[PDB]
Structures are given as structure tokens and as C-alpha cells.
Amino acid sequence: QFAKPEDAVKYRQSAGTLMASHFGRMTPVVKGQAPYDAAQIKANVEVLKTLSALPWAAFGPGTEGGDARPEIWSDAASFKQKQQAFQDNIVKLSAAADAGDLDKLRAAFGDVGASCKACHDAYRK
Amino acid sequence: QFAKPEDAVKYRQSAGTLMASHFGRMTPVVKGQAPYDAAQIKANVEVLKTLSALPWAAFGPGTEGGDARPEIWSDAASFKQKQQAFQDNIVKLSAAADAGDLDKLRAAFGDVGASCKACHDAYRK
Ligand code: HEC
Ligand code: HEC
């Protein structure tokens, strides 16, 4: 969907920015610093679920560029492994949010965040 | 959800960028230059539906800044009118995509695009 590779760069950056907002805005809730409203969290995690699927096509074949580490494309299968792990952790977070239990939310939130970090540690400068 | 107003700016810019990609990538399909796959379009419009709801909270009270025209905040009720019109056009596009009819998609796509432009003409520099 990208006329030039730089359009893929801008897309994936914007997807990451939105994911950070929808993930990180829950930090006070998972720490107990803000109240837990199950319906609020369920709706927000649905948004995050949608967003969470978006970057990866824009890191696929022919999207070389930007400031990411080049192993995304030279080791594309390894990048996909990190993606799979992340997307599976997102499913667990959706299940926690759908269940309406703060304990499950806390655990799944940590699972997701560690998975974001694992990919960044390998591929983000 | 924004620690400082500039975080709202970056959020809404990123939401617009993603909306442009998910809207504009359908242009070849609505022109007939690319094939119409009803299921493909239905799925893409579901993504656009989610994205389409996201900018507005980040243009609300206390999000003054960026390069947008200041009437967003000085005339907030008028901005909300443009938003309502847009979101109602999105519902029509979702219905067209769900129906699987290219004629309806063409009409609703034009409706949405004109509504994007109407808001931009008033509030985007
Ligand atoms: C690999 C499978 C990734 C996973 C999982 C996540 N991110 Fe990511 N992110 C990735 C790369 C290679 C990069 C660098 C290139 C780029 O897109 O900028 C990033 C970057 C970000 C950014 C910065 C975006 C920007 O505007 O420059 C953010 C804010 C970000 N990523 C957030 C984020 C979150 C919150 C994640 C889990 C919910 C997450 N990323 C997962 C690769 C990968
Ligand atoms: C008002 C109710 C709007 C509607 C409807 C749409 N947009 Fe928008 N957009 C709006 C403003 C005030 C601005 C300027 C400030 C900013 O967010 O940048 C924009 C900007 C954009 C951008 C540029 C984003 C960037 O990175 O700077 C894009 C690509 C964009 N808008 C796209 C877009 C599309 C495709 C819309 C309909 C599907 C649409 N916008 C509606 C305000 C409003």
C-alpha cells in the first residue's frame, strides 16, 4: 500500500506511536494508581488489538529504510519470530481484558510489554 | 492520556497518517484500477473504522498546540460538528463494505473523502 518505501517508514512509525499510547496509558491502572474500570480497559485493549497488527506489513519485503536495524530485512524470519511472540501475547491481554480481572490484566500487560522490549532490543536502534 | 500537550499532537498526527493510508489505499479499487475483493475491503474498512475514531480525543480540551488552526479549540463546538459529520460518513462506508457492493463502496468512499476535506479546509493549515 506504499507508493515509495518511505511511506512504509512513516506508516510503521505512526503505528508504533499509537501502540505506545494505547499500551502505556494503562500503566497507572495496572499499578493501581488509577481506578480499574473493566469496561474502559476492555474497550482500550480492543483498540490496541487492532493497532498491534498494523506495523508488520510495513516492515515486509521492500520496506528497507528508516532508522531501524537492517536485520529486520536481512534476517526477516527472525523478525517474524519476534512478531509472532508479540501477537500471541496480545491475544492473552485481550483475554484478560475481556475477563475483567485486574490480576490477569497485570500479568498479561507485563507479558506484552516484555515482548515489545524484546523486539526493540534486537531491531530498534 | 497525554503527559503533555505535545504528546496529543504526536498522537493525532499519527492517527491521521494511518487513516490516510487505510483510506487512500482503496483509491485504485474504487476507480476500478485494482480488483475489488469484497472480503479484503471489508477487513480494511474495519481497520479504518477503528482508526477513524481516534484523533478526536487528542483535539479536545487542553490539547492546544501543533500546527493546526486554533479555531479547533476556540470554536470547539464547530470542530465537533465536522467530526460528527465525518464519523457518520464512516458508518455509511462500513455499511457499503459490509454489503460487498462496489457501487455502494464508490459512493460511500466519496462521501468520506469529501468529509475529510471539509474538516481540513476549515482546520488544517
Ligand atoms: C518487533 C516485532 C516489534 C514489536 C513486537 C514492537 N515493536 Fe515497536 N518498533 C519496532 C521497530 C523495529 C521500531 C523502530 C522503527 C520504527 O518503527 O520507528 C519500533 C519503534 C517503536 C516506536 C517508535 C516509533 C516512532 O515514532 O519512531 C514506538 C513508540 C514503539 N515501537 C512502540 C511499541 C510498543 C508499545 C510495542 C508493544 C505494545 C511495540 N512497539 C512492539 C519493532 C517492534
Ligand atoms: C476534523 C473533524 C478532521 C477530519 C474529519 C479529518 N481530519 Fe485529518 N486532520 C485534521 C486536522 C485539524 C489536521 C491537522 C493537524 C494534524 O493532525 O496534523 C489533520 C491532519 C491530517 C493529516 C496529516 C497528519 C500529519 O502527520 O501531520 C492526515 C494525513 C490526515 N489528516 C488525514 C485524514 C483523512 C484521510 C481523513 C478522512 C478519512 C481525515 N484526515 C479526516 C482534522 C480532520
Ligand SMILES: O=N[O-]
Ligand atoms: O513503530 N513501530 O513500528
Ligand SMILES: O=N[O-]
Ligand atoms: O515466534 N516465536 O518466538
Ligand SMILES: O=N[O-]
Ligand atoms: O491527523 N489527523 O488528526
Ligand SMILES: O=N[O-]
Ligand atoms: O455534525 N454536523 O455537521
